[PDB]
Amino acid sequence: VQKFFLEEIQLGEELLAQGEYEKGVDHLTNAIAVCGQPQQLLQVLQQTLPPPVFQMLLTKL
Amino acid sequence: DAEAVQKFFLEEIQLGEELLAQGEYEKGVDHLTNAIAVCGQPQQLLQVLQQTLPPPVFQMLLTKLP
Amino acid sequence: MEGLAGYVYKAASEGKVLTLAALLLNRSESDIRYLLGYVSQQGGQRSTPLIIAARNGHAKVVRLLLEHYRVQTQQTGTVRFDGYVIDGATALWCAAGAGHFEVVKLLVSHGANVNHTTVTNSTPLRAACFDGRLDIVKYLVENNANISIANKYDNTC
Amino acid sequence: MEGLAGYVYKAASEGKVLTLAALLLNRSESDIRYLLGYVSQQGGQRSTPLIIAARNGHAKVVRLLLEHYRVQTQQTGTVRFDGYVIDGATALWCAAGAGHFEVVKLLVSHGANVNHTTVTNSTPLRAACFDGRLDIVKYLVENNANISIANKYDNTCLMIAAYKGHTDVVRYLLEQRADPNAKAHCGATALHFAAEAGHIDIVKELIKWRAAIVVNGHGMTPLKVAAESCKADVVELLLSHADCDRRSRIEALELLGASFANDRENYDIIKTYHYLYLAMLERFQDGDNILEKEVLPPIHAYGNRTECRNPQELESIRQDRDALHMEGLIVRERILGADNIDVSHPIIYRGAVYADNMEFEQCIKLWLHALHLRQKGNRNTHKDLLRFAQVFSQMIHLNETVKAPDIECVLRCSVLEIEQSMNRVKNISDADVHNAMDNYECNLYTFLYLVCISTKTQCSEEDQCKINKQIYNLIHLDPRTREGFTLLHLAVNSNTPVDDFHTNDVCSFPNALVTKLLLDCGAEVNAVDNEGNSALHIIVQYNRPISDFLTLHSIIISLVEAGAHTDMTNKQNKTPLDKSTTGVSEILLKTQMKMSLKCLAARAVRANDINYQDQIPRTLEEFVGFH
């Protein structure tokens, strides 16, 4: 679960780092689904990562 | 040394530089071979010559030095 | 003599690697550095075999003038010949603005001057900024020469 | 888990703050806290994750870590430097040393020790002084920075600020009631530090305070420290201050000329000669009751003539650049004295230049004088010994003879240095015991190279007898290696390192002549190492029996002739003929063997494992222990 959350968020971070925060949000949404708490996983993105990626991942997840 | 050898020395330095830069290493080193033979300080020039030519080219000169 | 000063000038103002070795050979250390202290104007600008060879881009020629010979690192010459010809040039300065990164990575590693100030109190970093060579800019910032030098008109790099 | 610990370390290293937040969520707190309290021991550091987050300026990583799992920022950890390993007490100290104001201010906002002393009490303010960040200095002095903290080397942070050209930090520190006369361990101060480093503006900034001026440990004003290096701007500023009498000013100008006479970094004969002439003109400005420098006899080896007492003398010998350097070094030595460490480094440089110019005798004499000065100062003198064996090797490779009395003198000096090295090995506990062991090994290697050089050349019978006496004294000291190799074992083994310089042209261990010299001077051939191998075991373990068979046959013959029990055994209890690994050496040893009742009986006793204990004479007990 955590490894799948770590792999999907890393895949989402690759698309987010290129300027496509919304495109990587969909992959990070699966990471939130892979994680035990999708809200807590998305809370890290809001606290640390860019807000555009975190805001789009909340609707996707 | 000096006199017409000195102008022959610098001519072989300049022509030896050009052919080495051009790529004619066999004629360039041979032109420089005459320069070291007529050089005022062939041993002191070889101190600088250890860094001027590439190590294959310097070894190529080393075969023609004696 | 003044005749040999122009001979050793063209030794490094071109890129030849044996003329400066041959001309300096069999001479005393007094007039050898006098030939390397060449400051006379060539082409409407003061030139010096260390300074001009760095502008030419030959990292090998300048290295043989600092390791096996003694030359003055600080000197007066052009930094941008294209209508600026500002005096007080450095060997690092000539290589930085002209994209000679191999000369740039060699002089600072050897211990050349990194923060020489000309009459316009400029830096080699902004000269590389005009050229746009990121490697020279990254090397200068990593070596921490200066990242805040502006011109006399406060023109930031 | 250990994978979680490594993943914490990676997240703090490359700034993966999102992965760190995933670590600090979705699980418990005690185990995750323990895992984030340390990193893996990679790269010689057990540092805090916050320390390595401050190393690359990742304030977001440490901020999110403190927000999720609040940990004390005072968590210590090993921190590496360019050539030093000092275990950092806190992350903000590393941030100040790496120039990151954001991490420092965030850690102070979270609540942290502003003056958390490091292993060598390195203050974060001191680290900022090292880096030169003025904003960090201002913030810590707002947060009650401890500006009086000095190292074991008594290095107050003002000294560290004055090390480099951080003049803004220096002026702000002296504005904040600093100590411009803070003494160091060796008597140094920011005045001497800026005199050595050539920061004239820092000198003027301290002159603005002008509290006091103090001498160093050897004893000399910072004018002499400025004249000790090529820092003529500080020298001219302090002469403009002119807080000295005439003669001291004259000899300070002499020292300023002398430092520029034989410096590797910058060197011009013109400026040195002009400074010498101006100093002597100031000397002759007295006129009546003229002060003059004391006359000293010329050292026969170091130099050949005394000083010049007339202006026309150096006016004439200006072209004699070697004489100018000799006179400058002579006045430098007679002023600084033998106690000053830096008296021999220009001598070393000039000797290296002379060796480069094939002035071999001058180089040998200068380096002998430098070694004499360094040994009288009781310093670490292995690097110059290695270079000196190197110049022997270069001369022998160029088919140039050496001076046998010089060989004997430097062999006596090396024996005395090995005695000093043994004393400082057996006296120190754990300070530089590894460095001391490496120094002892290098000294033994250099002595072996010197012996090989002496055997390569030809020497007079009296000089050879003196050399044999010195080698006999050193082997009477019986030096041992880390594994217990003696000098004979070191000469026997082909595993003995040889320096990458021209020593490879002359050092070809196993060397038969060195072994012959040791055996005639009386080396203990029967001596063994910790592994139990003797000289015979190592020489029969040689792996090129035919490429250099002359040396192998000569050393086997010498070892048999001096007398070594060929049946003696190592810890694994096998003979050299059993440890042959080579047909040629085995046959040579077999035809060089010798029958004996005692040896065969001891071998039978050892093989049959009869209770030899307490049934034989004690000498028979070590005899059985050999077998």
Side-chain angles (χ1 to χ4, degrees), chain A residues 12 17 19 24 31 33 36 38 50-52, chain B, chain C, chain D:
Chain B
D1 58 357
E3 297 98 19
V5 170
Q6 188 59 259
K7 69 179 181 68
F8 174 75
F9 177 47
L10 291 190
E11 274 188 354
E12 291 314 287
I13 297 299
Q14 288 184 358
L15 191 40
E17 273 159 339
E18 285 139 21
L19 305 160
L20 275 165
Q22 281 143 23
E24 291 190 356
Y25 305 145
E26 189 184 10
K27 300 174 212 138
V29 168
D30 283 344
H31 265 281
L32 273 192
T33 310
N34 287 318
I36 308 166
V38 309
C39 189
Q41 269 163 343
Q43 292 191 2
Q44 289 198 7
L45 191 77
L46 274 162
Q47 174 190 3
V48 191
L49 279 163
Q50 205 176 355
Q51 307 94 23
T52 59
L53 315 181
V57 182
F58 196 46
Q59 178 175 356
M60 184 201 319
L61 169 73
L62 275 166
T63 49
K64 316 175 202 188
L65 275 176
Chain C
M1 67 198 69
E2 62 265 6
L4 300 159
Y7 295 154
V8 304
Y9 153 73
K10 292 154 87 162
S13 88
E14 201 275 344
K16 299 289 94 175
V17 295
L18 267 297
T19 46
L20 73 165
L23 284 152
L24 286 181
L25 207 66
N26 282 98
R27 271 82 186 267
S28 179
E29 209 54 50
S30 79
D31 63 317
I32 275 168
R33 292 192 294 223
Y34 183 77
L35 295 193
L36 271 66
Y38 195 52
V39 68
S40 177
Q41 289 84 236
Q42 277 71 235
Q45 180 67 51
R46 310 190 181 92
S47 185
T48 290
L50 171 83
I51 288 301
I52 180 59
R55 183 48 65 88
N56 300 332
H58 315 291
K60 191 261 172 192
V61 173
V62 286
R63 190 170 190 170
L64 266 291
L65 269 190
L66 53 86
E67 184 71 35
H68 308 80
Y69 283 120
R70 313 272 75 78
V71 76
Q72 320 309 110
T73 52
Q74 292 80 244
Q75 196 57 255
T76 287
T78 185
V79 286
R80 293 293 99 189
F81 202 86
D82 46 355
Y84 289 86
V85 289
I86 295 164
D87 294 352
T90 318
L92 171 65
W93 208 330
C94 299
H100 315 321
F101 180 50
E102 48 266 5
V103 194
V104 160
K105 75 198 292 183
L106 189 66
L107 297 157
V108 193
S109 65
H110 173 71
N113 193 5
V114 308
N115 264 355
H116 156 75
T117 70
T118 181
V119 297
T120 74
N121 56 90
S122 164
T123 176
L125 184 59
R126 59 147 303 281
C129 281
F130 211 67
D131 201 1
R133 267 282 171 98
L134 185 143
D135 49 7
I136 302 184
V137 171
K138 189 165 278 191
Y139 189 77
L140 192 146
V141 168
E142 273 173 32
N143 279 272
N144 297 287
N146 222 313
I147 55 163
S148 77
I149 287 182
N151 297 87
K152 52 195 193 300
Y153 314 109
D154 300 333
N155 203 336
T156 309
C157 49
Chain D
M1 300 189 287
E2 73 287 340
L4 312 175
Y7 187 74
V8 166
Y9 167 55
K10 292 188 293 292
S13 300
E14 64 252 12
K16 283 265 172 59
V17 59
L18 292 168
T19 71
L20 176 74
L23 289 169
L24 268 56
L25 269 295
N26 213 9
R27 285 95 62 83
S28 175
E29 61 97 22
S30 43
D31 47 345
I32 307 303
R33 262 297 283 279
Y34 185 75
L35 294 163
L36 63 85
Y38 82 115
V39 307
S40 177
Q41 276 71 237
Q42 183 258 328
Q45 48 96 32
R46 55 101 175 174
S47 69
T48 311
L50 321 180
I51 279 179
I52 209 164
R55 260 180 164 213
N56 45 12
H58 288 148
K60 293 290 294 176
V61 171
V62 59
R63 191 73 265 150
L64 269 295
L65 196 147
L66 295 179
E67 279 157 3
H68 292 309
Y69 278 169
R70 60 178 66 89
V71 67
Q72 277 315 291
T73 66
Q74 285 70 242
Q75 166 58 262
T76 69
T78 294
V79 177
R80 204 175 174 83
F81 268 89
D82 49 351
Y84 322 110
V85 180
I86 310 296
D87 308 350
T90 182
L92 58 91
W93 174 76
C94 291
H100 300 125
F101 191 32
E102 46 267 31
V103 190
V104 161
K105 67 166 76 70
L106 284 182
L107 260 58
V108 171
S109 302
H110 195 62
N113 221 25
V114 295
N115 313 314
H116 205 190
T117 53
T118 305
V119 160
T120 57
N121 62 81
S122 175
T123 316
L125 170 82
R126 177 177 176 175
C129 289
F130 175 74
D131 210 320
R133 300 278 80 78
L134 198 48
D135 45 352
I136 308 180
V137 173
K138 293 186 293 280
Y139 191 51
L140 277 296
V141 304
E142 280 149 35
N143 304 321
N144 302 299
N146 217 343
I147 75 179
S148 84
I149 296 302
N151 209 289
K152 177 200 276 193
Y153 298 108
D154 216 351
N155 267 289
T156 304
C157 53
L158 187 48
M159 311 306 109
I160 296 90
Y163 281 165
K164 302 288 98 175
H166 315 326
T167 81
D168 49 351
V169 188
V170 162
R171 68 175 34 87
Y172 187 70
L173 197 43
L174 62 84
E175 269 153 9
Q176 293 321 292
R177 309 310 163 175
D179 185 16
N181 297 116
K183 191 64 68 69
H185 62 299
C186 57
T189 315
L191 302 103
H192 321 81
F193 278 138
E196 268 291 294
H199 307 303
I200 174 172
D201 46 3
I202 299 192
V203 180
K204 181 53 69 70
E205 273 287 339
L206 269 71
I207 281 300
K208 195 259 286 185
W209 218 247
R210 53 194 176 270
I213 185 167
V214 74
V215 296
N216 58 339
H218 299 160
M220 63 212 59
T221 183
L223 173 59
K224 319 301 171 72
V225 178
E228 183 178 1
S229 293
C230 308
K231 309 301 161 296
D233 48 354
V234 189
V235 192
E236 290 317 301
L237 182 136
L238 284 178
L239 292 184
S240 308
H241 289 346
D243 52 355
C244 280
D245 46 347
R246 295 184 69 189
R247 177 185 273 264
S248 55
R249 172 171 192 276
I250 290 145
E251 58 90 16
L253 277 150
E254 289 273 276
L255 262 62
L256 162 68
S259 309
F260 200 65
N262 296 269
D263 194 17
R264 178 66 179 87
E265 281 79 16
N266 48 359
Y267 155 66
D268 302 301
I269 316 167
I270 314 300
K271 299 288 95 176
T272 287
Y273 156 75
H274 277 89
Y275 289 164
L276 287 162
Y277 189 57
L278 264 293
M280 186 179 288
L281 280 184
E282 193 64 40
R283 171 161 265 127
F284 273 72
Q285 201 259 326
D286 211 327
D288 52 352
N289 53 89
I290 180 171
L291 63 93
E292 274 300 318
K293 41 206 167 293
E294 270 178 343
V295 54
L296 276 75
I299 297 89
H300 174 44
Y302 155 63
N304 281 313
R305 65 143 182 82
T306 180
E307 301 172 359
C308 284
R309 255 175 288 113
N310 303 315
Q312 87 259 17
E313 272 168 335
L314 74 163
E315 278 285 326
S316 54
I317 71 160
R318 180 250 202 199
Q319 277 322 108
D320 290 339
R321 34 157 308 170
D322 48 334
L324 292 189
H325 308 128
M326 281 302 163
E327 192 161 343
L329 295 191
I330 276 168
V331 307
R332 190 182 174 91
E333 157 64 54
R334 78 161 159 84
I335 291 299
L336 298 189
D339 47 350
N340 225 334
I341 312 173
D342 203 74
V343 75
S344 56
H345 160 57
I347 299 180
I348 279 179
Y349 152 76
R350 188 52 64 184
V353 166
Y354 283 169
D356 267 326
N357 308 334
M358 309 326 156
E359 276 198 9
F360 282 137
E361 185 58 46
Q362 281 265 300
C363 167
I364 296 299
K365 293 172 311 181
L366 284 158
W367 288 2
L368 275 164
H369 198 69
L371 186 50
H372 271 298
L373 291 158
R374 219 174 282 278
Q375 284 295 145
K376 273 143 56 190
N378 194 12
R379 320 192 163 84
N380 194 356
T381 71
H382 65 293
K383 305 293 284 182
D384 61 358
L385 276 179
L386 178 56
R387 300 173 320 111
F388 186 76
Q390 282 168 2
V391 72
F392 290 169
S393 65
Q394 187 173 1
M395 290 186 284
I396 293 310
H397 180 76
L398 269 69
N399 309 94
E400 194 54 51
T401 80
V402 303
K403 259 70 187 187
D406 292 343
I407 309 290
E408 184 260 340
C409 188
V410 73
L411 278 180
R412 168 182 69 259
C413 290
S414 64
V415 162
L416 191 151
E417 191 267 349
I418 286 189
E419 295 167 76
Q420 167 55 249
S421 72
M422 266 306 294
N423 296 308
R424 61 187 172 181
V425 162
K426 72 181 69 95
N427 285 330
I428 200 66
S429 58
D430 201 75
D432 46 333
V433 56
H434 170 85
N435 176 83
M437 281 174 180
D438 302 0
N439 201 350
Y440 197 37
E441 279 310 279
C442 175
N443 293 310
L444 274 191
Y445 301 154
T446 48
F447 173 73
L448 212 56
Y449 307 149
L450 285 180
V451 172
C452 200
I453 279 289
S454 64
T455 50
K456 278 291 275 301
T457 185
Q458 202 268 324
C459 304
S460 88
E461 64 276 0
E462 211 284 321
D463 293 331
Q464 195 44 257
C465 176
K466 282 199 307 300
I467 281 154
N468 284 128
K469 191 82 192 66
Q470 302 285 347
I471 299 175
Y472 157 71
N473 211 338
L474 189 43
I475 202 60
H476 175 79
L477 190 139
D478 190 53
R480 323 286 312 208
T481 64
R482 212 154 299 106
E483 49 264 54
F485 282 153
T486 176
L487 190 68
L488 199 68
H489 290 190
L490 196 58
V492 158
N493 201 343
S494 66
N495 278 125
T496 303
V498 183
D499 191 84
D500 51 350
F501 210 60
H502 294 50
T503 68
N504 317 125
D505 291 331
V506 301
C507 313
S508 65
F509 307 142
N511 184 282
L513 306 154
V514 173
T515 312
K516 171 61 67 65
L517 215 62
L518 297 198
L519 291 179
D520 63 56
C521 84
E524 286 203 2
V525 55
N526 285 339
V528 300
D529 60 351
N530 193 15
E531 212 184 346
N533 318 106
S534 86
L536 208 59
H537 302 76
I538 306 179
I539 191 50
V540 76
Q541 262 186 290
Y542 186 64
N543 67 330
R544 291 137 68 205
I546 308 173
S547 164
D548 50 316
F549 174 68
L550 282 176
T551 54
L552 167 70
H553 178 88
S554 284
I555 189 181
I556 292 296
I557 287 300
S558 198
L559 281 194
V560 168
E561 182 66 26
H565 201 114
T566 79
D567 303 331
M568 81 170 75
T569 60
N570 53 329
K571 297 295 190 293
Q572 294 89 341
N573 311 338
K574 48 196 199 292
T575 59
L577 56 92
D578 215 343
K579 206 190 271 280
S580 163
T581 74
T582 284
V584 161
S585 70
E586 158 186 330
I587 300 308
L588 200 48
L589 210 60
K590 281 281 289 301
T591 187
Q592 280 327 106
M593 270 273 273
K594 183 68 176 176
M595 280 286 170
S596 177
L597 287 84
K598 212 192 299 189
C599 81
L600 289 201
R603 170 172 295 149
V605 162
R606 208 52 182 280
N608 300 17
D609 284 330
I610 320 290
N611 178 31
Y612 81 107
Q613 270 300 287
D614 195 0
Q615 313 308 311
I616 53 182
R618 43 182 73 190
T619 75
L620 272 298
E621 270 192 350
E622 292 84 4
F623 198 88
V624 170
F626 281 167
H627 296 65

